[PDB]
């Protein structure tokens, strides 16, 4: 409030939680060694009109041959950042290898199809992993001629993503199955002319498309990590197949399905994990947290304070009081007493006083305070009278009570130079 003399009241302030104590890290026990040193170390990788496709599953990815590397001419991760790739377990992902010039690499992009990526192979702007490229003028460039390998540059219409057709049509604008080169009848295929002598844009570069099947099967490849135990009913961390997080775990009560993993209660939350080694539990990421407001009588009786926690049931209160994960941590700090009711929760500095007064401090739901002390509430001046036959209250003397009433007339006439 920015003061030194302060008066009395339920005064709200900044927020708390429980700092998460441990972590539960869950993998399956899968291990295999990827053909990274095959998919990125061989030479049999076909052309662009025959764009290759390899399947990846049940492996372990290193993500280390990639960054600690000088082999690569043109690398960028597109859907992702490379840095936190090591913390990603995927499933069943895909790569496509082919031999090109040094100029399609720019048209190798989401969108941006141009000619060859408008006639041979195609993406959305969406489902993106990474893209790797390097020169192999030292395996794939015979200045005698790479007459061996081709692409296609003729088609009716534009491409669709992730599609392959080999059919060297005797191509013609309106059908005409021909014997090319009868006139207006050609073929889409075309060689490469890759020479050992040529420059940047024209030497054969081996380029790999890195499409990442993410979170669409229970994760078969993992990154180099180590799994942990379980921790029931404690504010801790999560780290799953791709799901880290913060909160509390506890088993299910539900009707789960064999393909299934996530629950996303109202939105995008996953709500639950089928553990990657056969358990099926809930999620409660809200450990306990929220707001606090303090009660103090206001510097003219005392300076003794009392603390209102507002999202608890007095379970973890004295816990994180002694487990020491309370973000308004205190050196002025005790453990004295707690009143438990007003399901916002636990109020420290307080005793359930059975006799009740005029409700100074409006605690939550019905409960109120005094001195300090606290009761529920005296509801008002309880009398007990009723109807009468004839005897009746009549006045003979009286009173006049002039009272206040306090009303504004108008707030301040202000204004703003918006231009200054």
């Amino acid at each position: 409030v920015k003061s030194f003399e302060i008066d009395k009241g339920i005064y709200q302030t900044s927020n708390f939680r429980v700092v998460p104590s441990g972590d539960v890290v869950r993998f399956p026990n899968i291990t295999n060694l990827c053909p990274f040193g095959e998919v990125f170390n061989a030479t049999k990788f076909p052309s662009v009109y025959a764009w290759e496709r390899k399947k990846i599953s049940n492996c372990v990815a290193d993500y280390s041959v990639l960054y600690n590397s000088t082999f690569f001419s043109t690398f960028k991760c597109y859907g992702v950042s490379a840095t936190k790739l090591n913390d990603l377990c995927f499933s069943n992902v895909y790569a496509d290898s082919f031999v090109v010039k040094g100029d399609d690499v720019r048209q190798i992009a989401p969108g941006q199809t141009g000619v060859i990526a408008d006639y041979n192979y195609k993406l959305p702007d969406d489902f993106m992993g990474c893209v790797l490229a390097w020169n192999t003028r030292n395996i794939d460039a015979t200045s005698t001629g790479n007459y061996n390998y081709k692409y296609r540059y003729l088609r009716h219409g534009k491409l669709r993503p992730f599609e392959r057709d080999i059919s060297n049509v005797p191509f013609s604008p309106d059908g005409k199955p021909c014997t090319p080169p009868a006139l207006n009848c050609y073929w889409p295929l075309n060689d490469y002319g890759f020479y050992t002598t040529t420059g940047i844009g024209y030497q054969p570069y081996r380029v790999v498309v890195l499409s990442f099947e993410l979170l669409n099967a229970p994760a078969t490849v993992c990154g180099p990590k180590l799994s942990t135990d379980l921790i029931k009913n404690q504010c801790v961390n999560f780290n799953f197949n791709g799901l880290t997080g913060t909160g509390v775990l506890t088993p299910s009560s539900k009707r789960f399905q064999p393909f299934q993993q996530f629950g996303r209660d109202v939105s995008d939350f996953t709500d639950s994990v089928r553990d990657p080694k056969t358990s099926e539990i809930l999620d409660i990421s809200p450990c306990s947290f929220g707001g606090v407001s303090v009660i103090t009588p206001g510097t003219n009786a005392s300076s003794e304070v009392a603390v209102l926690y507002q999202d608890v049931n007095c379970t973890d209160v004295s816990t994180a009081i002694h487990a020491d994960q309370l973000t308004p941590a205190w050196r002025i700090y005790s453990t004295g007493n707690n009143v438990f009711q007003t399901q916002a929760g636990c109020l420290i500095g307080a005793e359930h006083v059975d006799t009740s007064y005029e409700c100074d401090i409006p605690i939550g739901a019905g409960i109120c305070a005094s001195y300090i002390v606290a009761y529920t509430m005296s509801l008002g001046a309880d009398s007990s009278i009723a109807y009468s036959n004839n005897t009746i209250a009549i006045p003979t003397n009286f009173s006049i009570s002039i009272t206040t009433e306090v009303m504004p007339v108008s707030m301040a006439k202000t204004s703003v130079d918006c231009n200054m």
């Binding site: 009746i392 009286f398 006049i400 009570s401 009433e405 009303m407 007339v409 707030m411």
Partner: protein, 156 residues
Amino acid sequence: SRLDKVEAEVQIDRLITGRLQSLQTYVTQQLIRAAEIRASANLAATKMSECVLGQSKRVDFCGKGYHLMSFPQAAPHGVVFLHVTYVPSQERNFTTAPAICHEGKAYFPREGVFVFNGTSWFITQRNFFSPQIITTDNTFVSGNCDVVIGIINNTV
């Protein structure tokens, strides 16, 4: 200092953005408070017409007793209301007989209950112990003696 060019102006437009939005935020809540306060001010003038400029016959709107007078006082952005009320204080315990069969017919005084049968002495106020020489003007003809309660006589 370290700028010249549109990246500059990008940062500038971010400043414009945030200051614009917070500025509008200010203004919006200002108009909110203006609405709250103007409705309350409508009530205020309403009472100033009512409580101050007359004896407001509606009860407990001006004050919290019975509104004998009301005395207004200005204030910085505000106004103060001296509600000269009336609260009665000396409680009694006295008895009655509502309908009176005096000569064989029912009697109700003045619309204005409790015929004071503290030994059938007078007929009183709503709100006081008051001596009243009872008359026929302090009753009316009400048919005959059929649903009467009190049997009081000597009705002067």
